[PDB]
Amino acid sequence: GVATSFSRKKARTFDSSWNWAKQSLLSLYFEIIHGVLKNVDREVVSEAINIMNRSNDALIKFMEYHISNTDETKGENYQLVKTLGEQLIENCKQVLDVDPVYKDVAKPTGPKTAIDKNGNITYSEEPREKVRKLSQYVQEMALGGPITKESSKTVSSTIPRETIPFLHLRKKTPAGDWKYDRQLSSLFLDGLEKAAFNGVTFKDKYVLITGAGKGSIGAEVLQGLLQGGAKVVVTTSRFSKQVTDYYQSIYAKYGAKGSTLIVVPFNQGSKQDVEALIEFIYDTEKNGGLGWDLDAIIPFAAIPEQGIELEHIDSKSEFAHRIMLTNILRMMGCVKKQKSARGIETRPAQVILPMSPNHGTFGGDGMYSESKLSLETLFNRWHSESWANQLTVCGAIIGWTRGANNIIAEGIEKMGVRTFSQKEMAFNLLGLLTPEVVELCQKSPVMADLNGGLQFVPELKEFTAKLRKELVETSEVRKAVSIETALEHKVVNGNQVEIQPRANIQLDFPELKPYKQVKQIAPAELEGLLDLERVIVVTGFAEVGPWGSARTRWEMEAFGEFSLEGCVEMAWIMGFISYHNGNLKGRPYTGWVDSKTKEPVDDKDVKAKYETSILEHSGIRLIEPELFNGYNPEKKEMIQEVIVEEDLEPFEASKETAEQFKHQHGDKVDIFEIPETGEYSVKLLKGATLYIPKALRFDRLVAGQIPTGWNAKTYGISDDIISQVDPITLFVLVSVVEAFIASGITDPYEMYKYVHVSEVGNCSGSGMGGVSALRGMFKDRFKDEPVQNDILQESFINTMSAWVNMLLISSSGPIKTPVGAAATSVESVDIGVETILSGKARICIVGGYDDFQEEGSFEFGNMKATSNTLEEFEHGRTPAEMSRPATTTRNGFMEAQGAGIQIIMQADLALKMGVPIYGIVAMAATATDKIGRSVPAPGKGILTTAREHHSSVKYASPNLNMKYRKRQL
């Protein structure tokens, strides 16, 4: 556990709150209109608060457009979104310049434990009847309860005389013991009321929080800090894609304007990581640091200890104690050292120490009580040592917080003890970061007690044990009695069918609305205005890519996971499941079976049995040599030319082979017949030229690969075609077939019922074409490996189009294969549009295709166009997050392979054939940039597609008015 986990390269910065504000606004807007939020619930209010916290002028204009462009006559939901968004625009205008504030608006929830008649324990977080707002929560804390009693106006006025509020601040008496203090407690409760009503800001507050994973108090504290505008360095001991995505989602939800979230890997159990993290925080941005000075430290990192009594104190308890005490002291000292080296005496960091009210009262928690109790020495050390000016101690004695220990929270609430939720405890803790409590800590260290009055129950450990024992015995007795009653009833009286889903993969043809509905949206003057022969429509489409077909790729694109249909399609694509129909193990079976074991597999089980393999072998992942002919980028085979220094031992070779060797090497080789068998001995001499294989460690280990197990046989392409054509051609054939299926053209010759063979063109092409055939001709022929004599024609970029036409289409229509590097598919769509518009074709196969291979990968790495996988691993990036467009950290593109095809044609003919229309290709243009000496450098050349003249625009064109054009028509 002391193993280092921190590294500077692995830190992730989240600061694009402007963009996240716009995204959150769109999400809330669409949820309201779609009815996911029928009323103004606290989630809607909280999302509005996040939008307000990120409010800026661009966000105001964004909201103004999206609420003014809303039409309110389209049902009450749109009127609701319009009025709510007008209110939000008003409220964001008010806080346009105001600092972002942490304002929690979720309903307070208490514990509820219920025992069913059959002895089933259910725990729920029901809303509290008495308390409904955070303001009311603060009032309840101030009031307290009977157990806390002992022998215009702020909430500190409403506290009863001779009482202990549930949340208070203590004061150290001259005797050295901490006692409840009315003044400090009143100040803290007043700060809590201000936070609950107005919200509390944390602008210009630099916080270091450890132990803020999902489901912790630290996570809620971090959410509040981000709401308030803090610059938070959050640490994590489980640094992964899941955790980074979780923290990104938190920043995109609660990251106020000016807030920055720095997620770093970290092991608080290692002092090397403690020092390295503090150095990274305090170092200048030039030296790879953040250049931050911490205003708060919240070291909530810990590991649990269960069933570890005194006799069980061991390695785990030592490591836990290190994390919870020793490395927190080291972290505090590291911050002190940084501030002192920088001469910072007037910016103390507020250390919010997580303290337990109970030090060994429960037991069996290893060394946890030792750590928490030793954490109180910092109060005296603050006065007795020379780090007071750099750190201020704020011990938060955290009470019972609801995350076993929840089923009895209702039971402990029955005597006025108050138990908190994660949100409530986080609010209590962020109340310690208010400016007034900050100044209090700076004047002297503070002991906040957020214990909810838990200290006043006598023998809390034994009471908790008795509560759990009572609940357990009740549940067990009820369960046993119910079971025995059921058995007795069944014995006395002697002895519902469930329907499981079955995958029904839909082609997802466009939904066709009623004519009135479809006419309402288009202008009334469009009827007969357009030349449908000149209108181009994408009739069909398909692809073969790292997530299989267009359907499965779209499922992972939009919803991030596969439905039953998508998962079954992926398993079938990968050959995980095959279809079986007939006798199987005697009984007759009809359905999916496992391809290897042939055992029946149900559709419901397909996900449970193949999801992990599907995800592991789909999308962007480590390059698989079995999919690229044993190409391992870690061991990239090479050959080095060397001069032979001494004659090699003779080796046998054929007559022809020996003659070729002699032709090559001249006098540097000796070839001799063997009269025994007629073969030849070849003896290379000193000075001969020689090639020794060598291997190179190449740093592009990840590619977007068609999912493992994809086979053209699965789609029905015969082995002869597979052996003839390249894998690129197979991808294109499968894409073409799936695209015609999406078009509903099950038989391609049905096009010839409507058009001439001359009127079906193919205008798709490849950036580089048959790279496998190029490798054949340039490398394996050089190596004299078996290569088909017609590998040349299999390398051409137009060969895949030829194979499409001469396996499926039989058309004599135009063939125009474009090359455009990454733009060949848009080039293809443009060429196909021009073909149909010219009338040389009526139907056109457009799209594009390419294959991933060793040499193309290596040359892209040579130009550094692709992302260096070793650099990504240094940054802690997985293959799934290697490709991150439009991000601050993007450092090269992620290479992939596959094909994409679209069947486009005239709108008139598409209607005549009765084919689906997925979209109208309204425009398709290509462009070059300008004069320069860099081929791969992008440019604004395509900007000409928006070229327009505005010298005289004082009046609108009659030509842009459709009524005028309809009049002329």
Partner: protein
């Protein structure tokens, strides 16, 4: 259409009963397969007992109203 054809060829209107219980089971099995195919998740079978098919028009109407995509 398959369910209606099965009812036409296996359920006798004059006697208002299935000609054979095995035929009745056949039609019920087909309807259960329809429910499996067109249900999106776990759900109670609409035909819990085959005896409901004594009114096969009603059973088919219920099943294909619950799963109108199968019509």
């Amino acid at each position: 259409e398959v369910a209606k054809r099965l009812v036409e060829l296996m359920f006798i209107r004059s006697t208002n009963s299935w000609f054979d219980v095995t035929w009745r089971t056949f039609t019920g099995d087909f309807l259960r397969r329809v429910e499996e195919r067109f249900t999106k998740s776990k759900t109670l079978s609409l035909i819990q007992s085959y005896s409901l098919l004594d009114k096969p028009d009603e059973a088919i109407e219920k099943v294909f109203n619950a799963y109108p995509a199968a019509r």
